[PDB]
Each structure stands twice: as structure tokens, then as C-alpha cells.
Amino acid sequence: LRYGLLAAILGDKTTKKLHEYSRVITVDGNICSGKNKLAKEIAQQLGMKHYPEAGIQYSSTTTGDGRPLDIEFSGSCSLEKFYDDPKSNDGNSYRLQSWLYASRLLQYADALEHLLSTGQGVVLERSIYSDFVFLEAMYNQGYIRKQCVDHYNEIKRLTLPEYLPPHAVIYIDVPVPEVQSRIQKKGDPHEMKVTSAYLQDIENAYKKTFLPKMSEMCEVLVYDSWEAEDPTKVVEDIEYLKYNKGPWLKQDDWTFHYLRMLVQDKTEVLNYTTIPVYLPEITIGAHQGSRIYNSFRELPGRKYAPGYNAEVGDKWIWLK
Amino acid sequence: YPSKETAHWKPPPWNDVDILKEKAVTNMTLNFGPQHPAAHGVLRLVLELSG
Amino acid sequence: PFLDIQKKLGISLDRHFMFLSAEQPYKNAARCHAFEKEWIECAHGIGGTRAKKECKIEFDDFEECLLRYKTMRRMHDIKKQREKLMKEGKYTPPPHHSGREEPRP
Amino acid sequence: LDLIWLEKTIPKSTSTLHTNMTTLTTNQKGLIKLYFMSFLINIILIIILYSINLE
Amino acid sequence: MNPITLAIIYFTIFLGPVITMSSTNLMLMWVGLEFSLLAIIPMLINKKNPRSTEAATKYFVTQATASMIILLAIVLNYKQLGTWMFQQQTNGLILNMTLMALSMKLGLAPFHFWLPEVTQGIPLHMGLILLTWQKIAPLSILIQIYPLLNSTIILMLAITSIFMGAWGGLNQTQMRKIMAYSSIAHMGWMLAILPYNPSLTLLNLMIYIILTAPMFMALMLNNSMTINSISLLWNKTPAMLTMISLMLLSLGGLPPLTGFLPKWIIITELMKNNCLIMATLMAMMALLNLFFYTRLIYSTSLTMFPTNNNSKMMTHQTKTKPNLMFSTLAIMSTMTLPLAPQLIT
Amino acid sequence: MNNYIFVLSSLFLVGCLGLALKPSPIYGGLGLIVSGFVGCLMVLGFGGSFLGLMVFLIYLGGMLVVFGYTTAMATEEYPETWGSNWLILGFLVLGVIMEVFLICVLNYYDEVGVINLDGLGDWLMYEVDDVGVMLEGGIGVAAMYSCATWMMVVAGWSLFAGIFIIIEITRD
Amino acid sequence: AMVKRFFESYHEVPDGTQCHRKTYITTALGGICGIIGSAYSVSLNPADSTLEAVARVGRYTFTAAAIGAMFGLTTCVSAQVREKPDDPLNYFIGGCAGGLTLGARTHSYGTAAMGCVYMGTAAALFKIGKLEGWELFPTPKV
Amino acid sequence: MPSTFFNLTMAFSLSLLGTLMFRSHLMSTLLCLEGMVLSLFIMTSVTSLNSNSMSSMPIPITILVFAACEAAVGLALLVKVSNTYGTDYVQNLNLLQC
Amino acid sequence: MMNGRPGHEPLKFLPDEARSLPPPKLNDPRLVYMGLLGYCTGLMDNMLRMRPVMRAGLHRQLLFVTSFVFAGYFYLKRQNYLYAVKDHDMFGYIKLHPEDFPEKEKKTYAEILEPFHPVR
Ligand SMILES: CCCCCCCCCCCCO[C@@H]1O[C@H](CO)[C@@H](O[C@H]2O[C@H](CO)[C@@H](O)[C@H](O)[C@H]2O)[C@H](O)[C@H]1O
Ligand SMILES: CCCCCCCCCCCCO[C@@H]1O[C@H](CO)[C@@H](O[C@H]2O[C@H](CO)[C@@H](O)[C@H](O)[C@H]2O)[C@H](O)[C@H]1O
Ligand SMILES: CCCCCCCCCCCCO[C@@H]1O[C@H](CO)[C@@H](O[C@H]2O[C@H](CO)[C@@H](O)[C@H](O)[C@H]2O)[C@H](O)[C@H]1O
């Protein structure tokens, strides 16, 4: 029985599953700040589920066979192209950022669905709550238009308030001169082209907007690099957080039911990311739009709903 | 069809939720004392009250 | 009714207090019980269109009993003619109409 | 004729009239006070027609 | 809402019209209409934003005012005849205020102004209840007293509703407002024929309902509130393009679709009664509805509007809707004209 | 005493005129209290007893809630009375004058139709069962418990559902 | 009421005679339509002040009364000159004269031209209805 | 009876006119609805008494029961309106014109 | 119009007097069309759920076809009965009122003088 009101009435209830570590934890920081290694160890030590940072292909890898798709099927945006030419007049900068917000939104709904249905906590690497620090950095560097900013803030206004924020927000503070050194050691040809002014904007957005905003409703834990390098120290701080603020305190069985009804329905989750606002950067004409859509339905496993694709081994179709 | 009367109409919000200007905090301000049985005759306790 | 559920099930949720002639507590007949009983019985089985013409006598009587337009007008005419004669000094009310009756029993 | 006056007098005047009627009847303020006033006019009109047509 | 509240409120929404349709006493009919008003308000305002609060308030004050006028007529008739049902002898003014107040409850023009606003302010699934389930109780009352009603007031209400439903729907870009004007136009047809043949009123009500229900389900599938939103269907759920187009043409009464039948039969019956001028005016202005439905068909299935990049992420997701009630109603609302003799008598 | 019921129904009319002018709801609430009392007297005057006392008791409770709601949600710095605004005052006086005129003219044209000032008091009580015992209005209302139980089922359901309705409307 | 009778007096005598009385009747009818329209206009589209509301009521009523006067006069004079009492064409000419008046009052040749055709056709059809016994609001028969 | 029922019908008409002619406060309109209810209660009660129709006396009580439910919902809605705007004025309730 | 007629049972789908009528053929063209609509409903439902239109859910397709035919048969019986009652009442009324429905003796074209209208 698919989850719904009947399943909820028959015992399937969220509050019975929540325990000490049924938490949403996000790890933030500038580029190359060590979020991934820390997020992996926080989740491992606490018995939580680690979600790697949602990328361009996040939706591709959580649907179908989980294999990456051709880029025209996956936002038609490129991070490498963004670093090579952040002011390309084909709209790549904002098309990328808009796609990454929607992929983060999908991941946040997937993580919340996991927590609400199982009671296991989740550990995220950035989130829809911290996605704007990249948008602000692009705008401050003149990489995107103001109308792109207004479009982004509208979609965020329509989607983010529907969800519960994380229980704890973990911030790793690495200064920009150190971030640049780590990017150069990292050795990615295009990422090495990122300006320090762009990295400073990210840090400015993080420290003036995101952290003060998040401290009103979440536990905030800030670390320098030397503290974060020992992930067991961070875990120890998490074990003794109190969680005496925010919206999670006033949730009951039926507010959790209706949030669960939202986050299991992915097209409902993504609804307002597709509002018909005709920003050129993210508007596709029908000729390109329909060519792309027709080819996508010719990929293996994609012509029909899952379980009805005989060419990938689906069986008993005539009785399904 | 545009009209002079409806020139100022905007489309409704995408989720039916309007961003309205912040509503007015309107707490009652009351002088509790000094001339009050509970004020010990000399305490001017200014109270902000909601109900 | 639009759906005759009550008739199909043979129950009465609201069919039995529909008019004056219906059952009353402690058998206290309502005003115009006999006139309404006659009008309802004349009309029964012939339909509303025919009833309008062919039960016209019964409806008028019942209408007069209930609203009493003619009774009020007739008494108004007698009392108005009495007022005219008394002013002219041609009529003197009897003692029993002046409050000096010989009460019965 | 074909490009001007046959256009102007048949399809284009029909389009103009119903667009004009559409904007005059759909330009409503959304004020419940005004609608209830107009419903009062409706009630009065129905009572007037009933009175004059009373045999 | 928790389950207990849903059960009680939805049960009362269902109960009211059942009481109205089954009641002999006019007071119990009024009680049924009272249950409908009270029970639907919490559903109207459930989402709790300024627009839903406005919609619930406007709905309440209109409906409560109309309910008082209906009660006045019932009480005046009780005074006149000592009974709780309208008769052949009921004063004609009493019957005319009943007609006025019920038409205000239905949203017939010129008592229509509230209905496009309330429909715009509420969720689509509540608009569906408002324009279908909530019509039945007031219409059921009218059908009971159809020989008593004044043909002049009815035709004037009817032609007014068709005219304003037409011109009203012509200016709309909001889907919820287009459906509200479509409601008003179709109510104009239902009412015009009620004093002549109430069976054809019910035929139009049924065909309107099975057209409107799947149209609302199609809007609900992606929550398409505007023309520009529904114009993305070709990219989001292209399989629906065939049935939306035929339902829209059926709502407009184009042959050989099922929606041609109510307009065709009502014209036939109106002209059996020499109501030629009204029938001509009604049929001519009903073409204006087909215009704004066609413009809607132009933007959904006959052209392809520009799409956006985020819609590709939607194509990766699986949907679980519509339910199979959509297909049944969609087919029976469009392809059943061959079975017309079984629907009128 | 032959003018008693006409005077009361005349007072009731003025009360509704005052309410219709809609001053501050404080005075609107008072207007309904007085009209409710006058309405109770009219029911009593026609031989009622239970119904008159019920409606006054119900409206006494109802306007107390409205008083509380008015002080929280329907108040201004300068609440309006009937005299505050010359325009409202004029229509109050004009409305009373038009009542005297309407009753005066209708008396002239018909004399026994809607208005019968000559016969006031002669057509209040029509028939009375002189030697009866069980006749008071409370007996009639009590038939909800025995002969008209459907009336009580629907009344009880509406109050019960009303609790669930108002809780839903008022939650944030 | 007698007010209804005052409007039945239009048809008591054949067209083309008593053109003074028929012009008063149609002028009165036009004024009433102007008052009804003005009531809906001011109620639903309120003016900026009361003097503008009253000014707009007068503008609508007199314009509507003028249209009704021109229709009634022109129709009767046309039937009197042409000596054709029962010709719907007389009513088309009157309805066109009314349509021209509406355009003259509103300063619009398009309303004059469009007004003339629509009002002429409506008035001509009214005469055909009167001659052939059409009913606008028939009572149920079958 | 004749003159009393005329005055009661006029009292209903005035209350309805009050309902239809809004001023500013929504609460003032909610009071006019209670005025129409009150008029209809007396009219029904007086009719039942004048005709000695004891089987109809439940009906006036049911009129008050549902009027109480109508009034309770009206007040509940008025709390919502006041929360949004800080007043109960009906001119604020105009977002649905577009 | 017929609802208040003599011997009218309330909310009776198929009155017992309807059992004198011949029942519809199970391959009646109206019942064949009903089953075709049920088949279309099944295919449309498959399309809307992105399933193979003809192949998926033959059990679901069969239930759609059988339900339409099953319901249509009983509804067709009721519609046959209502039309039969209408004729029973119409003709019965004609017999009770022979003065309102006289037999009109028609004249041959040897006696009728139709006007000739030359085409030219
Ligand atoms: C009395 C005669 C009855 C005539 C019946 C009318 C038939 C329906 C007409 C409306 C057509 C539906 O509209 C049509 O929908 C199909 C999908 O079904 C679209 O089909 C096309 O685009 C979609 C995406 O948009 C692709 O997935 C699809 O493979 C491609 O063929 C058409 O581009 C659209 O124009
Ligand atoms: C869908 C929701 C509805 C279901 C819930 C309600 C269930 C019904 C409960 C109310 C039952 C009322 O039941 C009904 O009572 C009345 C008396 O009141 C009985 O009435 C009986 O006694 C009265 C006494 O005056 C006689 O006049 C009447 O002729 C006779 O039928 C009905 O025969 C019975 O059917
Ligand atoms: C400016 C052009 C307008 C085009 C619209 C049509 C114009 C034609 C209508 C006006 C014609 C004269 O006016 C018409 O005749 C008289 C007026 O005394 C009345 O004539 C009619 O009255 C009543 C209708 O209530 C009928 O029962 C009566 O048999 C008939 O005489 C009509 O109420 C009026 O409509």
C-alpha cells in the first residue's frame, strides 16, 4: 500500500520512528573546505545516511538506471564552461545555478522522505538553504543579470518555505587565500580559473546572510580547518546538542503526514521550479525542446513508466 | 485585453500566497502604578500587554 | 421530494408535520383543521393542475378561515356604520354591549 | 474591398464589439461592497417588474 | 486536517444535499443548504493565506444572505397557507424571491460576481466541489417547484448568465476563472429549460459535471493555474493533449461531441414552446465560449509554447496520476453522442 | 392595551432600523439586545412563553460574545453612534418619518388590509381552547424528543459538526 | 399597474399617427434604460465623488432618452411620409437614427455606424415580431 | 396579527437592506444577519401561536440552532480577516479582483 | 412529466411491468458501442500512465469492456421501458379523448388546387 492517509491511519506514523539521531545535518563551507570528508565521517559515526552534494546529474543518477545522462537531458549546463567563461552570452551561468537549485531541492525532498519514513538521520553537503551563496557571488561578479536574481528568489520563495530546515548546520571556515591554495593543489584545470573575488563573495554571503539566518532556527556549529580535520571532535559536539529551537519542535503526526505527502511526490516537489517566467537564459524554444524530449523517451528504460520497459527486462506487462 | 482601468493589475502569485506589508504590532501600553495596590505606591511599572 | 427515499423505505422523517391538519401534541387541533382536511382530501389523487380549479371552493374557505380577510372587513363595516349612527344620534348600544350585561351562567 | 472594408465591417467589427463588451463587464474591483450594492439593484428591479405586471 | 475532522466535515458536505433532495418539508430543505455552507467553509480556507481567507469570507456572506431570503420565502408561505411546501396558491412574489435567492446561491448572473473570485482563491480540488457537488441542492429545490416559477425571470437570468459567462471567460488568463465563467454559462442553459422540461435541466447538469470533473483533474495533474502553465503540457504530460482538446470542444458544444447534446435538446424544447427569440440569442452567444476554449486549445495541443530548462528534471520523475476515473469521464464526456436517445428519455 | 402589540412591533421595527444603519458594533450589539427583548414581549403577547424567553436568552449570550469580539477586532479610535454622523442621523429620522407615512397611507387606501388602525386589538388572539390544560409552547418544542426526532437529529449534528468546523477555521 | 398601460398605448393606434404620444413613450423607455444602466455603472464602477456619480447618471439617462426620442420620432415620421403603417423598414430607419444619435453623443463614427446597423436590425425585428405574433417570454405549453 | 406581521416583514427588509449596503466593519454586517434571523424567528413563532400549530414549534428553535452555527462560523472567519489585516474592514478583502 | 403517473414506484430502476418487454440483444449495436468505449477507456488510461497502450493490463482492459457492456445492458432495459411507457400513455390518452384527435379525411390531388409558381 503506497503511503497515504490510509497507511497513516493504520499505524504508519513518523513520531514512532524518531529517535536521538533522526536529524537533518548539513555541512557548509567555501570551495575545497573539506565538507565531503567531514560529512562522510559524521554520517558514518552517527549511523546516518550520507548524501553526497547534489550535482548536475543528481536527478539522472536517482532515476532510470542511475547512470549519468547526456547533458542536454540534464540541464544543458556545465560547471567547466562556467569557469572558462562565466559571462558567456548563452546563459550558462544562471542556467547552471537554476538547475543546481532544483537538483538540491530534489535531494532535500529525497533526504526528508528517507528520514520521515525510516527515522534514520541524514547528512547533506550544502542545501537549498545555502545554495544562494553561489547565486550572490555570480551576481556580485556580474556573471548573471539582476532579472536572473529575481527569478531565483521567486522560485526559492515558492519552494523552500514548504520544508523543515536542518536540525544542525555545520560550517567549516577556511579563509579565501587558503581556499585558493587548495584549489591549485586540487589540480582541476577549469576550477583553477576561479577568481579570489568570487570566492570572497561566497564567504561574504555565508557569513553575513546564511549563518545569522540559520542561527535563528537551527543549531549552528562553526569550525576552523584544524578543528574539522578531526571529525570525531565534530561528532562529539553533535552528540550533546540540545535542539531547543526551530520548527521541528511543533511537528506532530499529522503535520508530518502532509509533509511526507509532499516529499514522496517528486513532480509536486519540482512544480514551482518550472513556472512559465520567460527568462532567456532558461527558456527553450519548442523545436529544441521537443527534439530533446523526443530523444529522452527513446533512451533505454525511459519510453514507458518503470516496470513497463520490455527492452530492459520488465516482465508480466500484460498483467500490470 | 488591456484597459485603462486594469492597467495596474498584476498577475496573482504563482502559489496563491501574497507578500503583504508587515502588519502593525499593537500592544497595549499600561501604567501599572505608582498609585496601584500592587505597586507599593511608588512603582511605575510600564507594561506592554497583549490581552 | 426530489428523491423519494422516505417513501421508498416507508419511513417518515418530515412527512407527518407538513400542514395544519397533521397530528398535534395531546390532540390539540390547530386552527382551521377541518377546512384544511377538506381541502387536502378534495385535492387528493387528481393532481395540482385540476385541484386548482376543482377544489377552488375548499381552498377559498380554508384561506378565509386562516387569514380571515372577509371576517375582518365585515366587522370593520359594522363597526364603521355604528360609529356613523352614534355620532348622528340615531343608535344607542344596548346595555349588554356597554358593559352592564347579566352574566351567564 | 477585400483587404480593408470587407475586413473592417464584418470580422473586425465583430471582434471589436465583443472585446469592448468583455472589458466593460470584467473590469470588476473585487469589492464585496460594490457587488452587494448591485445585488440590491437586481432585487429592486425584480420587485418592480412584478408590481407593474400585477393584474 | 486529522482523519476525524476530514470524516466529519466531508460527511456533512455530502449530507446537506442529500437532506435537501430527500426532504418534504421546506425547512429541512433549508437545513440541508445550511449544512452545505457551514461544512464547505473550512475546506475553502484550509490552506490559510490572504486569498483563501478572502474567498471563504466572500463565499460566506453571499451564501448566508441568500439563505436568509430563502428562509423568508418559506416563512411567508407558512404564514399564507399553513404548510411547509410551496403550492399552486403560493403568492407569486414569494416564489420570485425564492428564484432570486437560489440563483444567487448558484452564481447565476447578475448574482454571479462572487463566483469567479471565490473559485480563483481556493485549491483546484475545492473549485471542483464548488462548481459540481454544490450545485445539486439549490437546483433540486428549483426542480420541485418548476410549474410555479416565472418564465420571464428565468429567461432573463438565463440569457444574462450566458451573455456574462461568455464575455467573462473571454478576458481570462486564469484557469480557475475560466471554469467559473464556464459554470455560469452552463447554469444559464440549465435554468432556461427548467420551467419547460426539468429533465433536460438534469441532462445538462450531468453532462456539465462529467465534463468539468475531468477538466479539473487535468488541471490538478500539474497544478496548472494559468494559460501559460497549461501551455507546458506538451513537455510535462503530452498524453493528456488529446483528451483536454476534446473536453474543451465538448464544453463548447461542438458536434459531434457529447456536449453538443444539451444545447441541441434545450433549443429543441425551447422552440416547441415558441421560445424562439431567446433560443436564438442563447445559441448565438454560446459561440463566444467556443472562441476562448479554442484559444486555450491553441496554447496546449495545436502549438507548442516555449518551455524551460528545469522541466527536464520533471521528465526524469514518474507520476502516479491521473486515476482511472479521469479516463472514464473523459471518454463518456466526449464520445457518447451516438447514445443520445438513451440520455434524454 | 389595544395598541400594545402594535407598539411593540413598532419598537421592533425601529430597532432593526438602528441596526441597519450599522454604527459601531458596540451599539449594534445593544440594538439587537433591545430588539430581542421587544421580540420576546411580542411572542409572549401572542400567548407564547417558552419561545419568547429562549430567544432573549440565546441573544443575551450571543451578543456577549460579539461584545468580546468587537473590543478585539472591530474597534476604532472613535466608535460611531447613531448621532455621530449627520448622514446616519438624518436617515434614522427620515426612516422613522417614512414609517409613520407608510402606516398612515396604507391605512387610508385599504383600512383593513395590511394596516387596520381601527381594529387594533380585535385580531390578536383568534381562537383559544378555554378549558384546556396541555397547551403551552414548551410542549410543542418538546415534540423534538418524541414525534419530531428528525428535527433534533439535524440540530444536534449541526452543533456537533460546528465544533469541528470552528476549530479548523481558527487554527493557523 | 397604470405604468404598464402607459406603454401599451404605443400600439393602441397604427404607426405613423399620434407621433407625439409615441415619441413620449419611447423617450420614457429610453430614459428608464439609462437609469438602470447608470445604477449598475455607479454601483460597480464608483465615481471619484458624488457630484461625478450624479453627473454620470444624468449623462447616461439623457443620452439614452435622446436615443429613444429619435427612434420613436423617426419611425413615426417615416411611416407617415411613406404611408406604410406595417412596414418593418420604418423601424429600421428609426433604429438607425437612434444608432446615429448614440454615435453623435459619444463622438464616434464607428459607434454611429455600428450603432445604426445593430439598432436598426433589432428594431426591424421587433416590428416583425409584433406583426407575426412572436413571444419574448412564452409560458410553458408542452 | 395583520399589522404585526407587516411590521415584522418590514423589520426583515431593513435588516436585509443593512446586509446589502456595506459600510466598513464586517462585524456590523454580521449583526445585520442576526437581525434577519431574529425577525424570522418571531414571524415563525407568532404564526405557530396564531394558528395553534403546536407541531411546528420545533421549527423556530431549529432556526436559532443553525443561526448560531452560521454566526459562529462568521465570527471564526472574522478572526482570520483580522489576523491578516489588523482590522475587519471589507475594503481590504479585494485581492481576488486579479 | 411522467413521474407523477399512476402506479409509479419511487426509485425503482426496473419496474416489474418492464418484464413484458423483449430484452435487448447482447450484440445490440448500442451495447457493442458501449463495449468499444470501455475498450477506448482502457487504452486512454494506459496512455495517460505512460504504459504500452495495447499490451499493458489486459485484465484491466477486460474489466473496462465488461463493465461498460454490463451497465449498458441494464440501462438500455430501463430506457426501453421508459419509451414503452411513454407510448402506452400517449395512445391511451388518445383513446380517452377522441374529440381532441379526430380522424381527418384527406382529399386527393384531383380536388386540391395547389398554386403553380412558374420558374423563369
Ligand atoms: C471528429 C474527429 C475527431 C478528431 C479527434 C481529435 C484527435 C485529437 C486532436 C488533438 C491532438 C492532441 O495533440 C497532440 O498530442 C500529441 C500527443 O498525443 C502530440 O504528439 C507529439 O508531441 C508529443 C510531445 O508534445 C510527443 O511526445 C509525441 O510523441 C509527438 O507525436 C502532438 O504534438 C499534439 O498536437
Ligand atoms: C444519512 C443520515 C440519516 C440517517 C440518520 C437518521 C436516522 C433516522 C433517525 C430519526 C428517525 C425518525 O423516525 C421517524 O420517527 C417518526 C416520529 O418522529 C415516526 O413517525 C410516526 O409517528 C408519528 C407521530 O406523530 C406519526 O405522526 C407518523 O405518521 C408515524 O410515521 C416515523 O415513522 C419514523 O420513521
Ligand atoms: C433604438 C433602437 C432600439 C432597438 C431595440 C428594439 C426597439 C423596439 C422597442 C421599442 C418599441 C416601442 O416600445 C415598445 O412598445 C410598447 C411601449 O409602449 C410596449 O409594447 C408592449 O408592451 C407589453 C410588453 O411589456 C406587451 O405585452 C404589449 O402587448 C406591447 O404593447 C413595450 O414595452 C415596448 O418595448
Ligand SMILES: CCCCCCCCCCCCO[C@@H]1O[C@H](CO)[C@@H](O[C@H]2O[C@H](CO)[C@@H](O)[C@H](O)[C@H]2O)[C@H](O)[C@H]1O
Ligand atoms: C442622415 C445622415 C446624418 C448624419 C448625421 C448623423 C451622424 C452622426 C455622426 C456623429 C459622428 C461623431 O461625431 C464626431 O465625433 C468626432 C470624433 O472624432 C468629434 O470630432 C472632434 O473632436 C475630436 C476629439 O473629440 C477631434 O479628434 C476631431 O478632430 C474633432 O472634429 C466630434 O464629436 C464629431 O465631429
Ligand SMILES: CCCCCCCCCCCCO[C@@H]1O[C@H](CO)[C@@H](O[C@H]2O[C@H](CO)[C@@H](O)[C@H](O)[C@H]2O)[C@H](O)[C@H]1O
Ligand atoms: C440570424 C438571426 C436569426 C436566426 C433565424 C432563426 C431561424 C429563422 C426564424 C424563422 C422565424 C419563425 O417564424 C415564426 O415561426 C413560428 C413558429 O413556427 C410561427 O409563429 C407562431 O407560432 C405559433 C403557431 O404555430 C403561435 O402560437 C405563435 O404565437 C406564433 O409565433 C410562425 O411560423 C412565425 O411567426
Ligand SMILES: Nc1nc2c(ncn2[C@H]2C[C@H](O)[C@@H](COP(=O)(O)OP(=O)(O)OP(=O)(O)O)O2)c(=O)[nH]1
Ligand atoms: N557555480 C556553482 N558551482 C558550484 C555550486 N556547488 C558546487 N559548485 C562547484 C564549486 C566547486 O568548483 C565544485 C566542487 O564542489 P566543492 O565546493 O564542494 O569543492 P570540493 O568538493 O572539492 O571540496 P569539499 O571537500 O567538498 O568541501 O562544485 C553551485 O551551487 N554553483
Ligand SMILES: [Mg+2]
Ligand atoms: Mg565537494
